[PDB]
Each structure stands twice: as structure tokens, then as C-alpha cells.
RNA sequence: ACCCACUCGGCACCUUACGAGAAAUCAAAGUCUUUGGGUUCUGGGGGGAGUAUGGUCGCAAGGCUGAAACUUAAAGGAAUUG
RNA sequence: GGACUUUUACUUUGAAAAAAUUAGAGUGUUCAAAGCAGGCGUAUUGCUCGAAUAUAUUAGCAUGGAAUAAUAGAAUAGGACG
RNA sequence: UAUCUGGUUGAUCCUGCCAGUAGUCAUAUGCUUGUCUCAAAGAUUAAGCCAUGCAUGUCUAAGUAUAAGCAAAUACAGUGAAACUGCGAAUGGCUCAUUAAAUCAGUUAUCGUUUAUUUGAUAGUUCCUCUACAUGGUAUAACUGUGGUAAUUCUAGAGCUAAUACAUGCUUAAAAUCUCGACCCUUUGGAAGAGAUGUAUUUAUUAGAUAAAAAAUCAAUGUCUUCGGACUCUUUGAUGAUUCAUAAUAACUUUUCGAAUCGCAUGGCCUUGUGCUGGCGAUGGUUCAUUCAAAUUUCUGCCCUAUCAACUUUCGAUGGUAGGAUAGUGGCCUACCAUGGUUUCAACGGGUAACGGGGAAUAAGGGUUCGAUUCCGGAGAGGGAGCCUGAGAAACGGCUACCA
């Protein structure tokens, strides 16, 4: 969502099975593991030289992007590190040969590498159920009006 | 639904008591006697066999 | 339902078995084996409904428990053994050898082969990985695994195991031109050459195939079974060579036959 | 018994879900096993597929590993000193994953002289070239060498005691140890 | 101020049917069996009935919303004729 | 192999599309409802065709088109090209 | 495949509804009934109640034969009751009460998991720095005899005996590499001999590279040149993507597996010894893959109701961290911390004489109505709950408790 201090919880926040050696000292400071999500998705600059942990980010975290890739507009960001996406579409009633507008709310996960506000057409991808309702994860962010 | 489900139960349970109590005359161990008459129609016919 | 299913009601069978919809309410249901049950052909269906050797259920049992039907060089006794694609089953009593290959219509067709070519069998490699203790192994399209393959064999290629010891002989790669048998979908049973592989990231690669009569069609990659080079296959093709004549020109092909 | 199904929970719109089937078995949950300290008591639990899950009901002599030096020596356990999730697990000395405990340090101390030659807290000439080749690398972090003088180390269990029977782990070192000492002085 | 001519916007008036309607009549009730410019509301035979019941606003008088059971072959509207 | 690569709706073509049911091709079940059979021989150890095809308007995937209907961009240039 | 006609209607014209007419893979009932093919049938009301009988048991050459069973190899050898063992009983069949984003349909996912079985691969390392392996040990059933109960698929105590039961237990190559070191002879040092190194589990660490190319540095500094110091071909698989597959090191484990099983044949070798060696199978066994499945999961879609406008968080409601639990993800549960989540695009509540679907009737088109019912999926076995066995069951032709 925004920038906080790293170790604020009651447990140490670290990337698991990433071990920096306290004996040998290197100019490269902290062992930070990161990957690329594939599907032609570029790793954001903030994910590579960041300082957060976020075990559920598709980058620098332990999840995967496989399955459906969706698109919608952000309607709320009041949660902690997750947002709500409104998907708008038209439904075809066959009897009347006409359409009607509908909408559905998708709760997705947003990493602390994207700065996401309302507006914000966002591309998300299916991400291995992470809390009861949240099955997608924010991948790409495009602006609303600038 | 529960009032509907209970009422159908209450009317059937009253119905099934009505069938049993009307059939209380014929538990043929002590208090029953069904009266049966064999009436053959032909003189060449014995009710004994 | 609390555990695996054991029966199969007739009319829930695969349609390409051509089972009579009357005459009993149950279907063979092939047991577990080298092929998925919706793409296989049980030994009871092959020897009773297809070749008309047997006549009952207990009669085809007497065929098999006599140890007379050898599927892929090994003897079988289960009447519902899933004999599938490119199985090279043989009958030693009549000295006749079969290869279960699809017709152009899409159903399994009997195809008598010589004693030669009844000792080898093509198989599409489906996954290559490293096993325990560092050995690499490939797995083909009928559940078989072979250790120590040639290092140029990748996923979705063709290997040539013989029959008795695995031992992958020369293999066929995947590029433009290679002759392709189709093993699933609407174009089930057609034979042609690759012209274009449009890779899609996310799933379900599509392959463009042009046959010998310049009729292009598109299929998923899962249904693609490469069998050799342009005009030179590695097996004996079935009758009709996979051309898919249209419904009008099949009737005109019929009309040349009745009468004399 | 306990169920892990999501059909007994209210929906995302606040709706109440009405039951449609009884509890199944492929969704059961078992009662937690609070792994205490004392004599070794290990119980097997038959799981789906016929497998086994060794519930550690009372464990000691766990295997703790020195991360920087890359050794693992089987040591005793003195007790829990901090727990991030539940405070009451410290008060009853219940060993879980990611619980900060105190282990016996003498197997690690005994390993140091036989491998490096120096002595912390205070002939066979092939052994001194072993000591000289490994020399200029025996300098360790300042807090852990002070802990050897007390005879008692700090470590974190990285194993699941109630799911494998063993209580393994690793000893704290570096910035992670600096975080946990701050926790013991400001909250404990 | 009045007269003449034109124009824009009005309240209406008279004749007619290219059309429309069951007819009275209608420059809109026209451009609808050759049926689609946009869009809100309302109706679906008569009694029972604006009744019962619930909700709501009102100090009250009341208002707004508003059924069903049952029964019935009617209920109507336009113009002329003795 | 790297990237800039507006966002849609719409419509064509295609793939993956259970059988049964519906339409429909072939076939004298004695005709037919049906069924998927059967047909031809020197009927002396035989030969052989068939068991098609179509329909599914939503949702998802691929591709062709760029009219119609939306959407964004250079006005403090905080704009493009070397 | 496209026709209407009567009531109102008193003379006329229209709004209007009713009645008539026809179909029904739509139920009942009445009258009548010769022939052939074909065939639905206690769904609606009472998912109400059950007398009686049957519906799940099973043996090949290939697990155990001393039946005082039958019938014709001096350990047995043919057939074969009973019983132990293994497997099955979780399929089939029935019903539609529940159930309104639930089930279900089509389409995705498991880089988020379990899998008996079939199919294919897969085990020179076990005790050990002094020993049963031309083969370790017990219990028991069936049986013998003695009894109890009114009764049941009730069983007690006593004596026997087998395993593919249960409980233990060993052979097998050489090489290589690491720690520990008799050390000596004096060094730019190199050395006898001691241990360890399968698989499975658990933890920690390392490798798992690869956009094209030029020098000055020091440290670890090696083979060779010409000891100036020169310096090379250097091994790395797959995915769109991985902390993947796999490998290496340090250890851990009430130490998992690594054949004490069975059938059919008498082959070959000489050193001619009851020596050595060997064929064709059957059943087991660890891991991987495969198959039959299963559990969760993505997008979209469901009937009536505003006389239901706010709903969800007491008692998890939405999110975060950590743990526990599970086969596994996940508020699934727990501890703490946030205050969120849905809704006029109809949330939430209510009704359904609502299992969903493929499909059925009706035909000028679009539609209207129906779908308990021969196929697919879900659920239940009088109502709830709990659990054993097993790969699989919250099973009812299994058990336990409560209610009727």
C-alpha cells in the first residue's frame, strides 16, 4: 500500500531460505531473492532494490501467476496491502435481443511494489488462493488520467 | 416452511392414529372376531373343501 | 462417490466403439493401464465387436486365458485391458499382426501388418526430466519410461522403441514440414505436414497443418503426433491415407463401386 | 470431528450459508498437540493414504544447526523464552515452529576447539597446520561468543514438532538475533 | 397610432381529406399488418374492493401503498332510426 | 532473443467441444415404428462397403475486418525527433 | 406452415372477456376390445410403516491340509468341508427430503495435494575396527473334550498345531572421495593406517550460469614453460515463470525399505561333489512416472418477492503477521493488530406444492410451459451427531450414544 518500517510485527520478517553470511562481508549488502512472473511481465524496479518482504508477491515472493489474466478498475484501497477491483461487462438477454450492464467485485492482492489508488486500470493474474476470497494478484498498473 | 412442515406432520400423525384406533377392533389375539361366511353358489360345491 | 467407479453404462461409452445401444445395459470399462479410457480400446471390444472372432463374453475370455493374444510383445489376460494407439498386438495362432491406428473417420480401424514392423512402435515423448541418482528419463504417450535417452530429445517429439527392451532407436524432431498424424478433436485421423507453430504463452499451442491435397487445418498441439518426413512415414498408413473426403465426393467415390 | 470446510462460514456478502451435506472425512481436523519438555513421548497418527504423522507430545534433545559454520549437533533444550504468535506458550513451555528457545551450548563449544583450536570465554603437529589453514577465520559475531560464556545459546525451531516428531532448528545469528534481543528487553 | 408586405414565437378559429378512427371526429388522434426517433408512467372482464392486512406520513379528519378467497356472463363506448 | 506496443464493444472463420434425444445420408426389419445392419460368390474353407454429416447464438481461447458505437492523447508543453 | 365460430346482440359498429375447436413423451376415469412388433409402471398424497424370503462373497500349478472327509512319492504331493491369511464389501441398485451462487453447465488451475490397483522403470553398501543363513522365535483359529444362557451370526475356561499371520534376523565386486591421524625429515612439505559415504524422514547451507568484449591490482594462489611466471578448451536439463527436477556438505530418527515366500521343469560344467551354476513364472517391496480417481479452484449463467433497504462483526465478519491442523492452499482454527466486506447493476431477509443438466410438449417466426423418471453430476439411507477398518467411508444389507 505505502511505505512502513520492515520489522513492525512480533516476528522477524525475512525471505525464507535466504541466508546472508555474517562472517564474510560483501559490498553487495543484503541477499534479496527475486524472480520474474513470466507471460511477458516486466519486474518493477521497486521489487528488485526494495526492502519489503511480502511472501505473496509474484515477484520476490513464494506465489505463481498461472491461469486467467484479468483487467479492471480499482474502487477501494482501504484494506491492508489488498485492493478491490470492479469488473464491468454487458450481459445478453436473448429474448429481448438487448444487453444490460452488470458488474462484479474481485478482491486482489497488491504488492508493495505498485502504488495503486482509485482509478488505475490494473492487470491481475490468478494466484493460488491466499485468503478465503483473494485468488488474484496485481501484475501491471496503468494510469487513469495522470 | 417450518410451520408448513409441522402442520403436514400434525395432520398426518393425527391421520395415522385414526387408522390405528379404527383398526383396534381386529388385533386378533384376544379381542377380535372377524365373521366370515363361505357361500358356495353351486350344488356341486362343498364349502368344507 | 466414496471411491472409484467400477461399471460403465452403455451410452456412456466412448462413441468410437460403435457399440449397439440395445443388447445389455453395460459397457466394458477398460481397467487402468497405458492409455486413458476415453482414447483406448479394450480387448473384448476388439476381438468380439470389431474382428468377430469371439461371439460372447465368456468366449473372448477363452481366447485370452489360452494365452493367445500378445499385446506389445507381452501376454495379457484381462478382457478390459486398455489397448490404445500404436499398440502392435499380435495373434500367434493365425500368424496375423495388428496395429491399432485411427481411421480417417476417427474410429479405431484394424490394419494388418507384416511380421516386420510388428517388432517396433513409435511413441510421442511427453516429458523429459532427471530421475533419482542423476539419470535422465523420458516418458512416452503410453506410460512407458526409458532411462538414458539421447540428449537432443525434447518434449513433443517421436521416439522409436522396438518392443522388447525399450532401447529408443532413431527419433524424429519437431519443426516445419514433418508429417503429422492427428490424435484428437474434429480432425481426428487426418495426416499432413506442419506449416506453422504459433506459440502461445499461457497454454494450448496451435499447429497449422496442410495435407497432401492442400486443405489447411488448425489443431491444438496435444493432438499432434509427428510420424516422419514429408511423404516418407515410418509406419504403414491405414487405408485412405488420411485425406478426409467431403460428404459429396465420398458418395461419388461410392458410385464407382456398386455395379460390377 | 473438527472440519476445515469453508461451507460453514458466512459468504463474502455477509450471507448465511445453509448446510447441504454432512461433515465429510476428507476435511477433518485433529486436536492440537502442545509439545512439552521432558521424557521422549512420540505417537504415530495414521493419515490419508495410509501415511504417518509423528505427533511429538513431549520432546527433548533436538538437532540445532549453526548457520554460518554449517554444522549440526544434537543438543538439549532448556526451555522457551519467546513466542511470536501466542504469549501463553512461553508461560507453559510449549515448543512450536518459530519459537525462540535456549539450547545447551557445550556440543558447539566442544566442536570449536577440535576444529579451530581457540577457546571462547577466556603435539601432533599435523593438527596445527589444520589450525593454521583455518586460521584468520575464527573471528565470530560478538554476541554469540558472549553467550558461550553463559553456557546457554539462543535458537529458533524451524521444524514442525507436531507434524514430524522431531524438534529441529537453527541458532540465531546476525541481524535476526539483534531483532530478538530487542524483543526480550522491551516486551519480556 | 393606423395601412400594406415579410418574418419569428404564441392562444385559438374555419374548409378539406393526401391520411387516421368503431364512430363522434382528428394538421394531430397523420407519417402503424408497407408494424422500430428518444424516454417516463399506467391498464389486462364485472362484483367482492379502495374492502381486509401490514408499512408509512398526519394532532385529527385523513391521505399514500394495497390484495386474495368466493361469485358472475357479462361489463361497456359511438351514431341513427321508429 | 529486447522493447515501445490506447482500451473496448461488434462481426467472420477456427479449435476444444459425452452419448442418447432432434434434423439427416446409406440400408425392402414382409411395409412401418425401429435397428445399425448388411451385400456379393465357384455359397468347397471366400471377398467386401458401411456404422456419415449437421445443429449448440451465452461464458472462455485463437484469428481475419476496422463501418457503426464508446475511450485516451501536445495547452503552464512537465510534447515528439537526433 | 398461417381459415376460426357462438354468448354479450335489442337494428348496426367496435373494446372486451368467456365458451366452443385442436395437440400433449400428461395423469385419472368410463364404455368397448380380434391380430403383430414394441414397453412405462406407488414420482405427485405419507423421504409414512414394516411381517416373511432373497439382495456380497471369493481358490489357481503357484499363502497355510494330519478333516478320526472322499478317492487312488515314508516328510507332503489327487479332490477337498471347516478355519487362519489376502482381496472385496466405498461398485451396483433406489429415492429426490434437503439445497437459491449452493448443486449444476461449459471453461480453466494444482508452480497448492492424496492415490490401493494396472502399465513402465527402480535396490552389489544392513552386523562390523568373534555370528543360526544348506534358514531365528512364539502365540493361536479350525479340532478334541467339558459347560452356562429362554433366546441371538452369545460364548468361557482346558489341551494341540502351521503361515506371504505376528515378532526378529544375514551374505555381495573393486575403485574413488572426505574427516581423524602412526608420523618423519626438515619441506615450494608429504605420509603409513582408522572411520564415514544406499534408501527413507527432518533441519540448515551450497550449485542449479549463459546481453558481445580490454587492462592495472592484491589474497587463496594450481599444472607446466624457460619458475619469466604463461595460462587454455573449462559441466550445467526443463518451464511463460520457480526457493523446480537433480546433486553436494553437516547432522538427526522410540531407523522406513533393501525377499527367512510359492509353483512348473532337470539344463550345463568338470576337480564327479548329494560340488558349483542355471531356465520359465507367481506373489510381495521403496521411489518415480503412468492410469482409474479424488479434494480444492478461475470466468459467466438460476424461479417469485420492495407488504424485505440496508446487511455482516455477541458467537470471524474483510485484511495482515505468526503458529496449529490437514493429504494439501486458505480466517480452517488459535494469539495479536487493523476496520473493513456486499448493495438500487436489487445486497440481506422471505417463498419455492425447487435436486441441477442433457432434454420434453407445443410449430409461420420469436416464444410459452415442463423436466421426480432409462444418461451425467449432487445428496440421503427414520432424525441428528461421533467414530473404527482401509488406498478410498463421517458407510448405515458397519459400530456407538441420544430422540421418535
UniProtKB/Swiss-Prot annotation, chain A:
Pfam families: Ribosomal_S17, Ribosomal_S17_N
The record's account of how the chain is modified after translation: N-terminally acetylated by acetyltransferase NatA.
Glycyl lysine isopeptide (Lys-Gly) (interchain with G-Cter in ubiquitin) cross-link, chain position(s): 14, 45, 55-56, 78, 95, 104, 132, 140
Task performed by this protein: Component of the ribosome, a large ribonucleoprotein complex responsible for the synthesis of proteins in the cell. The small ribosomal subunit (SSU) binds messenger RNAs (mRNAs) and translates the encoded message by selecting cognate aminoacyl-transfer RNA (tRNA) molecules. The large subunit (LSU) contains the ribosomal catalytic site termed the peptidyl transferase center (PTC), which catalyzes the formation of peptide bonds, thereby polymerizing the amino acids delivered by tRNAs into a polypeptide chain.
Positions where N-acetylserine occurs in the chain: 1
Keyword line: Acetylation, Cytoplasm, Isopeptide bond, Ribonucleoprotein, Ribosomal protein, RNA-binding, rRNA-binding, Ubl conjugation
Organism name: Saccharomyces cerevisiae (strain ATCC 204508 / S288c)
GO cellular component: 90S preribosome; cytosol; cytosolic small ribosomal subunit
Record-given protein name: Small ribosomal subunit protein uS17A
InterPro entries registered for this protein in UniProt: NA-bd_OB-fold, Ribosomal_uS17, Ribosomal_uS17_arc/euk, Ribosomal_uS17_CS, Ribosomal_uS17_N
One annotated GO biological process: translation
Any one GO MF annotation of this record: rRNA binding
From Swiss-Prot, chain B:
Subcellular location: Cytoplasm; Nucleus, Nucleolus
Subunit architecture: Interacts with RIO2.
Role played: Required for 40S ribosomal subunit synthesis. Required for normal export of the pre-40S particles from the nucleus to the cytoplasm. Its subcellular location and association with pre-40S subunitshifts from mixed cytoplasm/nucleus to all nuclear in RPS19 disruptions, suggesting it acts after the ribosomal protein.
UniProt similarity note: Belongs to the TRAFAC class translation factor GTPase superfamily. Bms1-like GTPase family. TSR1 subfamily.
Further details from the record: Present with 1390 molecules/cell in log phase SD medium.
Protein name per its UniProtKB record: Ribosome biogenesis protein TSR1
Record organism: Saccharomyces cerevisiae (strain ATCC 204508 / S288c) (Baker's yeast)
Gene: TSR1
Covered range of the whole protein: 51 to 99 of 788
Swiss-Prot record, chain C:
Record bears the keyword rRNA-binding: yes
Gene Ontology biological process terms from the UniProt entry: cytoplasmic translation; translation
Domain of life: Eukaryota
Cross-link (Glycyl lysine isopeptide (Lys-Gly) (interchain with G-Cter in ubiquitin)): 61, 133, 160, 167, 173, 178, 210, 232
Keyword set, alphabetical order: Cytoplasm, Isopeptide bond, Phosphoprotein, Ribonucleoprotein, Ribosomal protein, RNA-binding, rRNA-binding, Ubl conjugation
Keyword Ribosomal protein belongs to the record: yes
Modified residues (Phosphothreonine): 114
Record's subcellular location: Cytoplasm
GO cellular component, one term: 90S preribosome
A GO MF label: rRNA binding
Domain S4 RNA-binding span(s) in chain numbering: 41-104
Entry-linked Gene3D superfamilies: 2.30.30.30, 2.40.50.740, RNA-binding S4 domain
Residues with PTM Phosphoserine: 31, 246
PANTHER family on file: 30S/40S RIBOSOMAL PROTEIN S4 (PTHR11581), SMALL RIBOSOMAL SUBUNIT PROTEIN ES4 (PTHR11581:SF0)
Reported function: Component of the ribosome, a large ribonucleoprotein complex responsible for the synthesis of proteins in the cell. The small ribosomal subunit (SSU) binds messenger RNAs (mRNAs) and translates the encoded message by selecting cognate aminoacyl-transfer RNA (tRNA) molecules. The large subunit (LSU) contains the ribosomal catalytic site termed the peptidyl transferase center (PTC), which catalyzes the formation of peptide bonds, thereby polymerizing the amino acids delivered by tRNAs into a polypeptide chain.
Other comment: Present with 573 molecules/cell in log phase SD medium. There are 2 genes for eS4 in yeast.
Family the entry assigns: Belongs to the eukaryotic ribosomal protein eS4 family.
Official protein name in the record: Small ribosomal subunit protein eS4A
Organism field: Saccharomyces cerevisiae (strain ATCC 204508 / S288c)
UniProtKB/Swiss-Prot annotation, chain D:
Region called Disordered, residue ranges: 1-30
InterPro entries reported in the protein's UniProt record: Ribosomal_eS8 (IPR001047), Ribosomal_eS8_CS (IPR018283), Ribosomal_protein_eS8_euk (IPR042563), Ribosomal_Se8/biogenesis_NSA2 (IPR022309)
Keyword flag Phosphoprotein: yes
Residues bearing the modification Phosphothreonine: 61, 106
Keywords per UniProt: Cytoplasm, Phosphoprotein, Ribonucleoprotein, Ribosomal protein
Cellular component, GO, one term: cytosol
Predominant cellular place of this UniProt entry's protein: cytoplasm
GO biological process, one term: maturation of SSU-rRNA from tricistronic rRNA transcript (SSU-rRNA, 5.8S rRNA, LSU-rRNA)
Phosphoserine carried by residues: 65, 68, 72, 85, 142-143, 146, 149
One Pfam family of this chain: Ribosomal_S8e
Compartments in which it is found: Cytoplasm
Record keyword Zinc-finger present: no
Gene3D superfamilies: 3.10.290.70, Ribosomal protein S8e, subdomain (1.10.168.20)
Top-level taxon of origin: Eukaryota
Molecular function GO labels: structural constituent of ribosome
CDD domains xref list: Ribosomal_S8e_like
Reported function: Component of the ribosome, a large ribonucleoprotein complex responsible for the synthesis of proteins in the cell. The small ribosomal subunit (SSU) binds messenger RNAs (mRNAs) and translates the encoded message by selecting cognate aminoacyl-transfer RNA (tRNA) molecules. The large subunit (LSU) contains the ribosomal catalytic site termed the peptidyl transferase center (PTC), which catalyzes the formation of peptide bonds, thereby polymerizing the amino acids delivered by tRNAs into a polypeptide chain.
Family, per entry: Belongs to the eukaryotic ribosomal protein eS8 family.
Miscellaneous comment in the UniProt entry for this protein: Present with 15900 molecules/cell in log phase SD medium.
Name this polypeptide is given: Small ribosomal subunit protein eS8A
Biological source species: Saccharomyces cerevisiae (strain ATCC 204508 / S288c) (Baker's yeast)
Amino acid at each position: 500500500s505505502t511505505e512502513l518500517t520492515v520489522q513492525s510485527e512480533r516476528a522477524f520478517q525475512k525471505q525464507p531460505h535466504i541466508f546472508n553470511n555474517p562472517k564474510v562481508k560483501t559490498s553487495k549488502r543484503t541477499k534479496r531473492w527475486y524472480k520474474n512472473a513470466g507471460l511477458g511481465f516486466k519486474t518493477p524496479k521497486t521489487a528488485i532494490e526494495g526492502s519489503y518482504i511480502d511472501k505473496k508477491c509474484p515477484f520476490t515472493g513464494l506465489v505463481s501467476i498461472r491461469g486467467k489474466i484479468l483487467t479492471g478498475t480499482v474502487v477501494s484501497t482501504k484494506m491492508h496491502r489488498t485492493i478491490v477491483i470492479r469488473r464491468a461487462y454487458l450481459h445478453y438477454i436473448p429474448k429481448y435481443n438487448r444487453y444490460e450492464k452488470r458488474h462484479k467485485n474481485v478482491p486482489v492482492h497488491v504488492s508493495p511494489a505498485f502504488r495503486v489508488q482509485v482509478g488505475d486500470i490494473v492487470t491481475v493474474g490468478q494466484c493460488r488462493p491466499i485468503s478465503k476470497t483473494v485468488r488474484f494478484n496485481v501484475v501491471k498498473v496503468s494510469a487513469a488520467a495522470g | 416452511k417450518l410451520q408448513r412442515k409441522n402442520k403436514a406432520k400434525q395432520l398426518r400423525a393425527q391421520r395415522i392414529l385414526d387408522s390405528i384406533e379404527n383398526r383396534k377392533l381386529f388385533e386378533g389375539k384376544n379381542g377380535a372376531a372377524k365373521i366370515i361366511t363361505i357361500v358356495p353358489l353351486v350344488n356341486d360345491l362343498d364349502p368344507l373343501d | 462417490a466414496r471411491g472409484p467407479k467400477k461399471h460403465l453404462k452403455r451410452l456412456a461409452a466412448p462413441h468410437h466403439w460403435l457399440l449397439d445401444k440395445l443388447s445389455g445395459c453395460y459397457a466394458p470399462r477398460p481397467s487402468a493401464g497405458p492409455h486413458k479410457l476415453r482414447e483406448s480400446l479394450p480387448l473384448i471390444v476388439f476381438l468380439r465387436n470389431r474382428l468377430k472372432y469371439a461371439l460372447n463374453g465368456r468366449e473372448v475370455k477363452a481366447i485370452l486365458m489360452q494365452r493367445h493374444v500378445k499385446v506389445d510383445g507381452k501376454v495379457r489376460t484381462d478382457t478390459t485391458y486398455p489397448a490404445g494407439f500404436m499398440d502392435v498386438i499380435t495373434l500367434d495362432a493365425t500368424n496375423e499382426n495388428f496395429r491399432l491406428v485411427y481411421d480417417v473417420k476417427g474410429r479405431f480401424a484394424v490394419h494388418r501388418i507384416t511380421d516386420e514392423e510388428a517388432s517396433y512402435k513409435l511413441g510421442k515423448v511427453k516429458k523429459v526430466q532427471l530421475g533419482k541418482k542423476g539419470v535422465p528419463y523420458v516418458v512416452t504417450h503410453d506410460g512407458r519410461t526409458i532411462r538414458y535417452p539421447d540428449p537432443n530429445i525434447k518434449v513433443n517429439d517421436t521416439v522409436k522403441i522396438d518392443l522388447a527392451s525399450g532401447k529408443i532407436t532413431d527419433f524424429i524432431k519437431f519443426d516445419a514440414g514433418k508429417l503429422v498424424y492427428v490424435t484428437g478433436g474434429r480432425n481426428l485421423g487426418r495426416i499432413g505436414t506442419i506449416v506453422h507453430k504459433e506459440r502461445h504463452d499461457g497454454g494450448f499451442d496451435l499447429v497449422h497443418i496442410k495435407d497432401s491435397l492442400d486443405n489447411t487445418f488448425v489443431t491444438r498441439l496435444n493432438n499432434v503426433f509427428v510420424i516422419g518426413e514429408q511423404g516418407k512415414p515410418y509406419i504403414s498408413l491405414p487405408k485412405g491415407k488420411g485425406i478426409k473426403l467431403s460428404i459429396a465426393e465420398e458418395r461419388d467415390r461410392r458410385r464407382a463401386q456398386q455395379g460390377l | 470431528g473438527i472440519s476445515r470446510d469453508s461451507r460453514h462460514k458466512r459468504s463474502a456478502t455477509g450471507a448465511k450459508r445453509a448446510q447441504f451435506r454432512k461433515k465429510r472425512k476428507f476435511e477433518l481436523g485433529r486436536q492440537p498437540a502442545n509439545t512439552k519438555i521432558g521424557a521422549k513421548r512420540i505417537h504415530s497418527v495414521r493419515t490419508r493414504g495410509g501415511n504417518k504423522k509423528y505427533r511429538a507430545l513431549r520432546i527433548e534433545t533436538g538437532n540445532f544447526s549453526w548457520a554460518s559454520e554449517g554444522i549440526s549437533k544434537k543438543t538439549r533444550i532448556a526451555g522457551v523464552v519467546y513466542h511470536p504468535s501466542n504469549n501463553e506458550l512461553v508461560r507453559t513451555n510449549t515448543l512450536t515452529k518459530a519459537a525462540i528457545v535456549q539450547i545447551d551450548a557445550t556440543p558447539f563449544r566442544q566442536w570449536f576447539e577440535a576444529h579451530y583450536g581457540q577457546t571462547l570465554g577466556k603435539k601432533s603437529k599435523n593438527a596445527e597446520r589444520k589450525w593454521a589453514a583455518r586460521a584468520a577465520s575464527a573471528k565470530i559475531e560478538s554476541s554469540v561468543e558472549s553467550q558461550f560464556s553463559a553456557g546457554r545459546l539462543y535458537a529458533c525451531i524451524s521444524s514442525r514438532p507436531g507434524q514430524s516428531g522431531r524438534c529441529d532448528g537453527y541458532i540465531l545469528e546476525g541481524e535476526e538475533l539483534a531483532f530478538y534481543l530487542r524483543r526480550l528487553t522491551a516486551k519480556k
